[PDB]
Ligand binder design. Structure first.
Ligand SMILES: Fc1c(Br)cccc1Nc1ncnc2cc3c(cc12)OCCO3
Length: 283
């Protein structure tokens, strides 16, 4: 007895939206709802087995509604299956952080940590396990507002059977076990990505070696800008005992307190157009 998932799946006419540019296949474009006087900036994502999986992603993405998770606007069932979502104009936080490293202050870094914890707490609320939390899967709406995305691996809660090895709890590398608490481990790796301005974790170490390194007690090192307060939070996300790791609701609180005095916790040197409507205001 779980609750009935009464989310709506919107089917969009391909005449309703005009592609504009390739971004990766993911395109950017513009969606004009049916006779409504609005233009929505949108990203658009484009065999049998593959279709089975992109519909899984659309199922999850249609079932979440939170300011820090990307929601599905709709699908389009043309000769190909397209997912339509809100355009996140600044793109990937992993790229954003590498591109502006000489320009990102402690306030932004800690606020990102809070928002990502909020998104993850919401997914935990929906008994939802992401399994691929990473800085490459956080998108940037504005520099002050990020959202978690990429739900291709999300499951509705352990688990079973390519996997992102350097972001995974040890119990997931070992037993294909996945928890909201294995997500917290991945959250820690993600925070480490942001505090190093985009370093690759265990850079140079082959994935085969990862499981034994974490078994020997080894962990990612303390980033330069990080006080022991921040780094210790990360280290707690990497406890062997999954129940010893912090809850997302607590990560929200700890990083919230730090974001009220950012410099005490991060040490960083130098602290066509009418009728356009963002998806977050088209309800
Ligand atoms: F479209 C998607 C769906 Br549907 C499901 C999952 C992910 C995506 N990717 C994106 N979503 C919204 N804005 C984006 C903006 C981007 C981008 C991807 C975006 O790539 C890099 C540069 O700028």
């Amino acid at each position: 007895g779980e609750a009935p998932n009464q989310a709506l799946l919107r089917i969009l006419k391909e005449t309703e939206f005009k592609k504009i540019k390739v971004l990766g296949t993911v395109y950017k474009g513009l969606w004009i709802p049916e006779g409504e006087k609005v233009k929505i900036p949108v990203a658009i994502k484009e065999s049998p087995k593959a279709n089975k999986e992109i519909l899984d992603e659309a199922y999850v993405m249609a079932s979440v509604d939170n300011p820090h998770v990307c929601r599905l606007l709709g699908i389009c069932l043309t000769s190909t299956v397209q997912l339509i979502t809100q355009l996140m104009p600044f793109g990937c936080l992993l790229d954003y952080v590498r591109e502006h490293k000489d320009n990102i202050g402690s306030q932004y870094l800690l606020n990102w940590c809070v928002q990502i914890a909020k998104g993850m707490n919401y997914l935990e609320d929906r008994r939802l396990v992401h399994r691929d939390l990473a800085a490459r899967n956080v998108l940037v709406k504005t520099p002050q507002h990020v959202k978690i995305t990429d739900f291709g691996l999300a499951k509705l809660l352990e688990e079973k059977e390519k996997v992102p090895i350097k972001w995974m709890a040890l119990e997931s590398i070992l037993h294909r076990i996945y928890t909201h608490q294995s997500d917290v481990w991945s959250y820690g790796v993600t925070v480490w990505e942001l505090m190093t301005f985009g370093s690759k974790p265990y850079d140079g170490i082959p994935a085969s070696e990862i499981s034994s390194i974490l078994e020997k007690g080894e962990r990612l090192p303390q980033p330069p800008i990080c006080t022991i307060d921040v780094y210790m939070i990360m280290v707690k996300c990497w406890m062997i005992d999954a129940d010893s790791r912090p809850k997302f609701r607590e990560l929200i609180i700890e990083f919230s307190k730090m974001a009220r005095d950012p410099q005490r916790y991060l040490v960083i040197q130098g602290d066509d157009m009418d009728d356009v409507v963002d998806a977050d205001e088209y309800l």
